[PDB]
Each structure stands twice: as structure tokens, then as C-alpha cells.
Amino acid sequence: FNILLATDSYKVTHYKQYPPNTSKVYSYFECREYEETVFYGLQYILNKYLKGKVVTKEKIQEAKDVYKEHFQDDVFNEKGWNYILEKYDGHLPIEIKAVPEGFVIPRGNVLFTVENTDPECYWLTNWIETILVQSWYPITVATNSREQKKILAKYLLETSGNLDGLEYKLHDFGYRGVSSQETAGIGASAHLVNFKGTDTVAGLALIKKYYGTKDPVPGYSVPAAEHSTITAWGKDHEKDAFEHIVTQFSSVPVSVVSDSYDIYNACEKIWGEDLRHLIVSRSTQAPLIIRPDSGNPLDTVLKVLEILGKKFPVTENSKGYKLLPPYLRVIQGDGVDINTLQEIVEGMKQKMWSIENIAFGSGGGLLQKLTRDLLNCSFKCSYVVTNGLGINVFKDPVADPNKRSKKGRLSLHRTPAGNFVTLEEGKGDLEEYGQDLLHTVFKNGKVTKSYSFDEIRKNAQLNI
Amino acid sequence: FNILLATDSYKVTHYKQYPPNTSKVYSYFECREYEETVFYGLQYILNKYLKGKVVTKEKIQEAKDVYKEHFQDDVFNEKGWNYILEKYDGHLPIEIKAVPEGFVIPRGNVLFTVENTDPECYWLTNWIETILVQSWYPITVATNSREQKKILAKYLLETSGNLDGLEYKLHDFGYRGVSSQETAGIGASAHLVNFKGTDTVAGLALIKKYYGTKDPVPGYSVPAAEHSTITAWGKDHEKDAFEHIVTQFSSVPVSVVSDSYDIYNACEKIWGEDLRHLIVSRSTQAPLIIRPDSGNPLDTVLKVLEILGKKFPVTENSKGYKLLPPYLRVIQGDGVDINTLQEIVEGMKQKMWSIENIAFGSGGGLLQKLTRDLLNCSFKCSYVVTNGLGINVFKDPVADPNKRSKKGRLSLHRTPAGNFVTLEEGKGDLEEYGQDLLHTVFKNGKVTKSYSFDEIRKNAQLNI
Numbered sequence: 068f069n070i071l072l073a074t075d076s077y078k079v080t081h082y083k084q085y086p087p088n089t090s091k092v093y094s095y096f097e098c099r100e101y102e103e104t105v106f107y108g109l110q111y112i113l114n115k116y117l118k119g120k121v122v123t124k125e126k127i128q129e130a131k132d133v134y135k136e137h138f139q140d141d142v143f144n145e146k147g148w149n150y151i152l153e154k155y156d157g158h159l160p161i162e163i164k165a166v167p168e169g170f171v172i173p174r175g176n177v178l179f180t181v182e183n184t185d186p187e188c189y190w191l192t193n194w195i196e197t198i199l200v201q202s203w204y205p206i207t208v209a210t211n212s213r214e215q216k217k218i219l220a221k222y223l224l225e226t227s228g229n230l231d232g233l234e235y236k237l238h239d240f241g242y243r244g245v246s247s248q249e250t251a252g253i254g255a256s257a258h259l260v261n262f263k264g265t266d267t268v269a270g271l272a273l274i275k276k277y278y279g280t281k282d283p284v285p286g287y288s289v290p291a292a293e294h295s296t297i298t299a300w301g302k303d304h305e306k307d308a309f310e311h312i313v314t315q316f317s318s319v320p321v322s323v324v325s326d327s328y329d330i331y332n333a334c335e336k337i338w339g340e341d342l343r344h345l346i347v348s349r350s351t352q353a354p355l356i357i358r359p360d361s362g363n364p365l366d367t368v369l370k371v372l373e374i375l376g377k378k379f380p381v382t383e384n385s386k387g388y389k390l391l392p393p394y395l396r397v398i399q400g401d402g403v404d405i406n407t408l409q410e411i412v413e414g415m416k417q418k419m420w421s422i423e424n425i426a427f428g429s430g431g432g433l434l435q436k437l438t439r440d441l442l443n444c445s446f447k448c449s450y451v452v453t454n455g456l457g458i459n460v461f462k463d464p465v466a467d468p469n470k471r472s473k474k475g476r477l478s479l480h481r482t483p484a485g486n487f488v489t490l491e492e493g494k495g496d497l498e499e500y501g502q503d504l505l506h507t508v509f510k511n512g513k514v515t516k517s518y519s520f521d522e523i524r525k526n527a528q529l530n531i
Numbered sequence: 532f533n534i535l536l537a538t539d540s541y542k543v544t545h546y547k548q549y550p551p552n553t554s555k556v557y558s559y560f561e562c563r564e565y566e567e568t569v570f571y572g573l574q575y576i577l578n579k580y581l582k583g584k585v586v587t588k589e590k591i592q593e594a595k596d597v598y599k600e601h602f603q604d605d606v607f608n609e610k611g612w613n614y615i616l617e618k619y620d621g622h623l624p625i626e627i628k629a630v631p632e633g634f635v636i637p638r639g640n641v642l643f644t645v646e647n648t649d650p651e652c653y654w655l656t657n658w659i660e661t662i663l664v665q666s667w668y669p670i671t672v673a674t675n676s677r678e679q680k681k682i683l684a685k686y687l688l689e690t691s692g693n694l695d696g697l698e699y700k701l702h703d704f705g706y707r708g709v710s711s712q713e714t715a716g717i718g719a720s721a722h723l724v725n726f727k728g729t730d731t732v733a734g735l736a737l738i739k740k741y742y743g744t745k746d747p748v749p750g751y752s753v754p755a756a757e758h759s760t761i762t763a764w765g766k767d768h769e770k771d772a773f774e775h776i777v778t779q780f781s782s783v784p785v786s787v788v789s790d791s792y793d794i795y796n797a798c799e800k801i802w803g804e805d806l807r808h809l810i811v812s813r814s815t816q817a818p819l820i821i822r823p824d825s826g827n828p829l830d831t832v833l834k835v836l837e838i839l840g841k842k843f844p845v846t847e848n849s850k851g852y853k854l855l856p857p858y859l860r861v862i863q864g865d866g867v868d869i870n871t872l873q874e875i876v877e878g879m880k881q882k883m884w885s886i887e888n889i890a891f892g893s894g895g896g897l898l899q900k901l902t903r904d905l906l907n908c909s910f911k912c913s914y915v916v917t918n919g920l921g922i923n924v925f926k927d928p929v930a931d932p933n934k935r936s937k938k939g940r941l942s943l944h945r946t947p948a949g950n951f952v953t954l955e956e957g958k959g960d961l962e963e964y965g966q967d968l969l970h971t972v973f974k975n976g977k978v979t980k981s982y983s984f985d986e987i988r989k990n991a992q993l994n995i
């Protein structure tokens with residue numbers, strides 16, 4: 068990895084475009100006006116990519132050679148990079164202040180600020196815009212996952228009177244559905260801010276290396292079938308496949324995909340009659356988890372529940388909702404996103420089924436079908452020093468008021484009613500609003516303040 | 532990186548679920564039934580993740596300890612992985628056959644097959660499903676980027692009579708808007724299959740290392756401003772910023788973002804009057820490229836062109852379309868995806884503006900707003916040998932015939948009309964359709980067949 072080659076190409080030319088006599092460029096990130104966002108993932112980027120000796124003679128030469136060919140021209144700021152190598156032994160003269168990881172912040176507030184600590188390095192602040200803005204991704208996954216947690220909490224509480232098992236109700240299925248190995252780990256770690264169930268193994272190492280937990284691992288799985296393990300037995304032998312698998316995993320929870328040929332027949336005839344004796348004997352700690360995986364997600368869940376409620380003893384919980392026996396549960400892992408998850412839990416409640424009966428698995432919906440535009444994540448220059456005088460800078464495009472940026476030096480505060488406000492134009496220095504919530508997390512090549520994964524989960528909790 | 536920890540958790544339990552005495556699992560990838568897809572990116576995966584000694588005593592021990600805690604149990608196949616280390620020096624006993632990279636193949640055809648080459652490693656075929664399925668991402672970037680080229684080609688030909696400079700008409704802006712560094716390199720490389728203009732630098736090194744080009748680099752950029760480099764001058768000095776920047780880059784193309792406060796004023800008054808003398812003196816090889824960046828994409832482009840058409844000497848080309856002078860162009864890089872790209876060029880044609888006048892930048896729409904479901908990318912077991920008997924396997928869910936999978940040993944063929952057909956159930960062996968078009972690209976830890984980025988580009992060309 069070479070930080071000199073990890074920026075937008077045009078940024079290589081910006082050192083020639085800023086006003087002459089500029090000693091400071093100060094910039095910030097917001098989720099510009101999903102009304103509150105979980106701030107998570109910066110600490111990964113600081114440690115992986117930004118800290119320590121990030122400039123060498125060799126990286127400067129490599130970048131010089133690449134850009135000469137890429138631009139067909141000599142624009143690369145070799146002198147500038149060489150200055151960092153010589154003066155700071157290749158450590159970035161940059162200060163970053165950030166809201167603590169896990170904090171839940173309303174849209175349109177400063178989440179982090181970036182400035183150069185040496186007047187020579189005025190061009191560096193926005194050099195690293197590209198890498199820092201990629202923080203949009205763990206923010207958005209963390210945020211969208213917690214929004215699904217809110218829906219789940221709401222309906223579980225209404226239909227059952229409590230929140231037991233909430234943290235295992237949305238399982239990460241997204242390893243194959245994301246764009247790379249690196250994305251898989253980052254995305255999976257972001258979902259684990261809110262939940263404990265994951266099949267995206269990549270998230271575990273990332274958390275362990277960059278954040279840390281008191282517990283051995285941040286996330287858990289159970290044995291589960293896929294279509295190749297059912298279909299390999301041949302179409303006439305689905306029953307043999309189910310029997311083999313549940314007997315193999317007789318003492319732990321086991322998920323068994325049941326829609327290879329006909330989900331309704333598998334529920335009613337195979338699980339519900341032929342193998343019923345191998346199900347009713349299971350423990351509460353080792354249920355059979357039937358997994359439908361096709362058809363309209365709502366229609367299918369409701370029909371599976373209807374089938375099972377006719378073949379197995381249903382109870383009615385204290386809220387008046389129907390409950391399968393403890394040895395039997397359902398996971399819907401197909402077509403799951405925040406919209407369809409809401410549609411399913413609502414349709415269930417309508418039909419008097421407890422949300423206790425159901426869990427969800429989500430791949431693409433959870434980890435891939437998200438953009439930097441969902442929370443309008445943007446990084447803008449708001450303050451510069453030119454000729455030793457500070458000036459408040461911003462954009463305000465005529466045809467789009469929603470692209471207006473903030474002015475001057477920024478700080479984030481609690482309001483008297485306990486909300487948040489971002490103070491502009493260095494007004495936080497007036498101290499009318501208690502103390503700035505942004506803390507220095509990076510300064511001059513060093514990570515200066517870290518958060519464990521345990522503190523992040525605590526910060527990101529739901530109210531209730 | 533540890534391949535033992537690079538699969539969906541459930542697959543760790545699958546070796547216990549297959550029928551007893553299974554010696555072969557054979558699987559395949561297709562873009563299940565955007566009618567044609569560019570096959571690109573498997574070779575990156577083969578080289579980075581799968582080839583060579585990918586199993587060591589330490590990776591086995593690492594995986595063992597992680598899974599013990601992740602499953603709260605001993606499920607991990609320590610013995611099977613030890614067998615691979617001991618028998619093959621940690622090289623994967625796997626054969627992969629694939630269509631050549633760059634090939635443009637209709638939906639619902641076999642793209643690659645995977646099978647184990649040791650009866651003991653029947654469980655390994657689908658172990659590596661997760662990692663290979665991520666090939667969806669470069670396939671989908673390459674395909675959607677090629678779909679945009681087809682639109683650009685059609686309107687450029689229609690408005691101008693030729694395709695000159697088509698390869699620079701869609702510029703990659705998506706580095707900040709993807710989910711990771713790795714993703715950035717992968718997606719940017721996929722875009723470079725069709726085009727030559729990129730600001731995502733990460734794409735260059737990936738191509739150079741994994742594919743190779745004749746040319747020093749596969750992609751090019753030009754100097755361009757961002758809002759920080761305009762706004763840093765102060766709102767009253769937008770002219771000084773513009774003058775400084777074009778004068779710094781007087782002899783190369785320069786892109787100047789012009790919407791910081793008022794795009795229409797910037798075009799009509801600042802570029803069209805105050806700084807006009809510095810524009811009309813520029814070379815054809817060094818145009819000013821005005822970049823609007825807000826407002827309704829189509830309405831803004833038309834209005835911008837209308838403004839410039841009144842301030843600068845417009846000609847009419849040989850097709851009857853209006854053309855700006857050669858020292859002046861426009862690039863629209865806000866809100867660009869394949870739908871809005873189509874709307875703008877069509878709206879331009881309607882107003883008699885040559886597509887020669889315009890280029891596009893795209894970030895999220897190009898590299899991030901895409902999922903594994905856009906081309907329905909799926910990997911399925913189609914053939915197993917159990918007790919020495921080969922059997923053709925598939926799924927066919929009742930409520931979704933679009934999830935039906937293919938049966939048996941597969942091959943890809945030309946039809947007599949020169950189209951593509953995928954033959955099932957070993958029927959390729961009958962020789963009635965000529966030769967299988969898949970080639971062995973990986974076998975037993977070695978990459979056995981390879982393509983340069985130049986062969987890939989040539990394979991991925993448009994018919995035009």
C-alpha cells in the first residue's frame with residue numbers, strides 16, 4: 068500500500084490550485100441533510116493506512132513514475148512529499164478530531180475534522196479526503212443495521228413483551244454478495260456493532276486487530292445447510308438429507324434450507340410428518356431452524372408458519388400471539404432488506420404470530436446495496452489561512468441549497484435539551500455550549516485515542 | 532490472508548452434510564436469467580487468493596481456535612485441511628474451467644466450473660464458493676460500464692458521424708464512493724476494460740500486477756479543480772481562482788468545477804466575458820473543460836451549453852449538430868448513472884448538440900450502486916459422484932422457477948448460427964456442437980491459462 072497512490076488523480080494537481088500563501092486547509096465530514104447515524108470505522112482507516120511511516124524514498128519514486136505516465140506530464144508534488152519524509156520521517160503532519168466511535172448523531176453535524184499541522188503541508192488535508200470519505204461505508208452499514216434493529220425491537224416487544232434474543236434476529240449472510248474481501252471484513256464488523264450473528268468470518272479478525280473485545284469473538288454462527296448439501300442426495304432423497312443433517316447436529320441449533328423442490332411439502336409432509344419425531348425431541352438450546360429461501364418473502368413466511376402451526380403444538384403467549392414450540396423456529400434469508408424485513412414483521416403481527424418465531428438472514432441488503440449517497444456523506448473545506456489571516460470558506464451552489472457546506476472552524480456540542488448542534492465560524496470558542504464532543508484521534512502520524520469494540524456497542528445501543 | 536477463514540461460516544459445517552462416500556462435487560457459476568455480460572476478474576482471484584501454498588500449520592491452528600469460539604463447538608474439519616497440507620504441500624486439489632476473460636456472453640450460460648481433483652476433498656469445491664462468487668463485482672462493473680459505452684457510441688455516431696474519443700467519454704470518479712481500497716482497485720480495473728479515463732489510481736497497479744498491458748498504464752487523467760481549490764480563494768475571488776488554475780495548466784486539458792456559487796453566472800460572466808481571452812487562446816489538445824456539479828443533470832447541461840453557445844463561436848458539424856470551439860468542452864460528473872447518462876445524451880440530441888461537446892464522470896453509479904443481483908450471479912452444485920455413481924443434481928424451487936439450476940456436467944458451445952449454448956447432463960461429450968469453449972484456468976494450485984489486459988479489452992469490444 069502506497070498512500071501517494073491512494074487519492075483521486077485530480078488531487079495530485081491541487082497543490083498548484085490553492086491560493087498562494089496558504090498555510091492551513093481545514094476540512095470536515097458530515098452526513099449532510101435515516102435521521103441519525105452511527106459513527107463507526109475511522110479507527111480502522113487510521114491504523115491500517117494513515118499512521119506511522121507512510122512515506123519512503125521508494126514510494127515517492129513509484130508515485131513519480133506512475134503519475135508521469137498517467138498524466139503524460141510531470142504534475143506530481145515530489146518536493147512536498149519529500150519534505151514529509153525528511154522532516155517527520157514520513158509521518159503525516161495532520162490532526163484529525165472525531166466524535167467517539169459508536170456515537171449516534173443526527174444528520175447534518177460535523178463527525179470529524181482534518182487539518183495540516185505544518186504550513187508546508189496545506190495540500191495534504193484534502194489529499195486524504197478520498198481515503199477518509201470511504202468511512203461512509205462502515206457508517207452506513209452500522210446505521211442501516213441499527214435501523215433494522217429498531218424495527219425488530221419494536222415488533223418483538225409488542226408481540227412478546229420483551230427483547231430476548233434481539234441480537235441474534237438479523238444474521239449477516241453477505242460475504243459472497245459484497246465487492247471484495249476487504250469490504251467483507253469492514254461491512255461485517257459494522258453489522259456486529261448491533262448484532263451478534265454472522266457468517267461473514269472476515270469481520271472477526273478485523274475487530275480483533277483494530278478494535279478489540281473482552282469476549283473471545285464478537286460474533287457467532289450455527290451449523291446450517293445450503294442447496295448443494297441437500298440436492299447432492301438426489302431429488303428423491305431430500306428426506307434422507309434432512310434426517311442425516313439434523314442427526315449430525317443433534318445437540319446444537321441447526322438451520323436446514325427446505326425449499327430445494329417444494330418448501331410447502333417439506334414443511335407439511337417431511338418435517339411435519341416423516342421426520343416429526345426427530346424434531347419434537349430436540350432441546351430448547353438446539354432447535355431446528357427451518358429456512359425457506361424463495362418466493363414472495365412475506366407470503367412464504369406466513370404460509371410456512373400456517374403449515375407448521377397445524378403440524379406442531381402452538382401456544383399463545385401472554386400478549387395473545389402465537390408461538391411455535393421451543394425446538395422449532397424459522398429463518399427467512401431470501402430478499403431481506405430493511406423494507407422487506409418491516410413488511411414481514413408487520414404481516415406477521417397482523418396474522419397474530421409472535422416475532423419470537425422468526426429470524427432473518429440478509430446478504431446484499433445488509434452489506435452491498437448501500438451507497439455513499441444514502442446518508443449524503445461529504446467532506447468539504449470550511450476554513451483556510453492565507454497570508455496569516457483565517458477565512459471561513461464554503462460552497463453554496465445556486466440550483467442546489469442541499470449542497471451548501473458549513474463555514475469556518477467547527478465544533479460539536481450538546482444542546483440544553485440534550486440534542487446536538489454543530490457550531491460554525493469558530494463559535495465553540497465562546498464556550499456557551501459546554502465542551503466540544505470531537506477529540507483528537509490522530510496527530511502527526513500517531514493514533515492518539517482508541518475505542519474498544521465493547522465501548523462502540525455501548526455507545527450505539529438503542530434507547531428503549 | 533487465510534483461505535480457511537475466507538468462507539461463509541456455515542460452509543465450515545458442510546463436510547458433515549454431504550452424502551456418505553461422495554468423491555466429487557462439481558459446481559458452476561452463471562449470470563442467471565442487461566442481456567449479455569462481460570466475463571472479467573476471476574484471474575485476480577486465482578492469483579491473489581487461490582494459487583500456491585495457501586494452507587500452513589499456522590493457518591490451520593488459527594482457523595481451529597477462531598471456529599471453536601465462533602461456533603462454541605468443534606465443527607472445523609482440521610483433518611481435511613491437514614490432508615491438503617500433507618498431501619499437496621498446501622496447494623488446492625481443485626480444477627477450474629472458465630470462459631476467456633473479456634468474452635461477452637448472454638445471460639444463463641455457464642461462465643466457470645469448479646470441481647475437486649482428489650476424492651478426499653469433495654468438501655473443498657463449495658468451500659471456495661464465497662470467494663469465487665465475488666467475481667460478480669468485476670463482471671457487473673465491466674458489464675454496466677460497457678452498457679454505458681453502447682449508449683455513448685450510439686449518440687456520438689448519430690450526432691457526429693464517428694466514434695473519435697469515445698474511450699474518454701465516461702470517466703471514473705468513484706474512488707471515495709466505494710466501500711474499500713480493494714474494491715476501488717477491482718472496480719476501477721473493470722471500468723478500464725471499456726474506457727481509458729480514470730481518477731481511481733488503485734485500478735492501475737491492480738492491472739499491472741494481475742493482467743498486464745503493452746502501454747505503461749491502462750488509464751489516464753488530467754488536472755481538474757475541486758470545490759476546496761475554488762472556494763479557498765473566498766466567494767468574491769472565484770474569478771482569481773479560475774484565472775490562476777487555467778494559467779497553471781495552460782498547455783494541458785484542465786477541468787474546472789464551476790458551480791461553487793452560481794454555475795450560470797460562472798459560464799456567462801466569468802468564463803464567457805471576464806476570462807474569455809484566456810480560453811479562446813487555448814490549444815485543441817488543451818481545452819478548458821467546464822464542470823458543472825449540481826442541479827438537475829439534464830436541465831443544467833442544456834442551459835450550460837446554451838450559455839456557452841452565445842458567448843463562444845459555435846459551428847455546425849457535418850451531421851447538422853452544434854459544436855463548441857475545440858478549446859472548450861463540458862464534463863457532467865454529478866448524479867451520473869446509466870439512466871441519467873441516457874437522458875442527457877438524448878436531451879442533447881433533441882436540442883441539436885453534438886455529443887462531441889460532452890463527457891461524463893461517474894462515481895457511485897459506476898462502482899458502488901451495483902449488487903450481485905443485477906445480473907443474478909449464482910453458484911450451484913450440478914453434479915456429484917457418490918458410491919462411484921455420478922448423479923446430475925439441481926434445485927427447482929416451486930414458487931420460483933427463476934431459481935432453477937442446471938443439471939450435470941456442463942459445457943459452453945457455439946450454435947450453428949454462432950450464438951452461445953450451455954449443454955447439460957454431460958451432453959457436450961456427444962460432440963454435436965463442436966468444442967467446449969471453457970478452458971482449464973486453475974488446476975491443483977497452479978494458474979494454467981492467463982489473459983493480458985490487452986486481450987481482455989479486445990474481447991470486450993463493441994460490435995461498432
Ligand SMILES: O=P(O)(O)OC[C@H]1O[C@H](OP(=O)(O)OP(=O)(O)O)[C@H](O)[C@@H]1O
Pocket residue numbers: 240241244360400401402403428429430431432909910934
Ligand atoms: O441477501 P442475498 O445477498 O440474496 O444473500 C442471501 C441469499 O444468498 C444465498 O443464496 P444465493 O442468492 O447465493 O442463491 P439463490 O439465489 O439460488 O438462493 C442464501 O441461500 C440466500 O438466498
Ligand SMILES: O=P(O)(O)OC[C@H]1O[C@H](OP(=O)(O)OP(=O)(O)O)[C@H](O)[C@@H]1O
Pocket residue numbers: 445446470704705708824864865866867892893894895896
Ligand atoms: O457519482 P458520485 O459518486 O456522486 O461522485 C461524483 C461526485 O463526487 C464529487 O463530489 P462529492 O459528491 O464528494 O460532493 P458534492 O456532493 O458536494 O458534490 C464530484 O465533485 C461529483 O459531484
Ligand SMILES: NC(=O)c1ccccc1
Pocket residue numbers: 239240241242266291292322400428539541
Ligand atoms: N447460514 C446460511 O444460511 C447462509 C446462507 C448463505 C450465505 C451465508 C449464510
Ligand SMILES: NC(=O)c1ccccc1
Pocket residue numbers: 075076077703704705706730755756786822864892894
Ligand atoms: N476529476 C474530477 O473532477 C473528480 C471529481 C470527484 C472524484 C474524482 C475525480
Ligand code: BEF
Pocket residue numbers: 292293294295360911926
Ligand atoms: F444454497 Be441455495 F442455492 F440458496
Ligand code: BEF
Pocket residue numbers: 447462756757758759788824
Ligand atoms: F469538490 Be465539490 F464539493 F463536488
Ligand SMILES: [Mg+2]
Pocket residue numbers: 360401
Ligand atoms: Mg439461497
Ligand SMILES: [Mg+2]
Pocket residue numbers: 445
Ligand atoms: Mg455528492
Ligand SMILES: [Mg+2]
Pocket residue numbers: 824865
Ligand atoms: Mg461534487
Ligand SMILES: [Mg+2]
Pocket residue numbers: none
Ligand atoms: Mg439469490
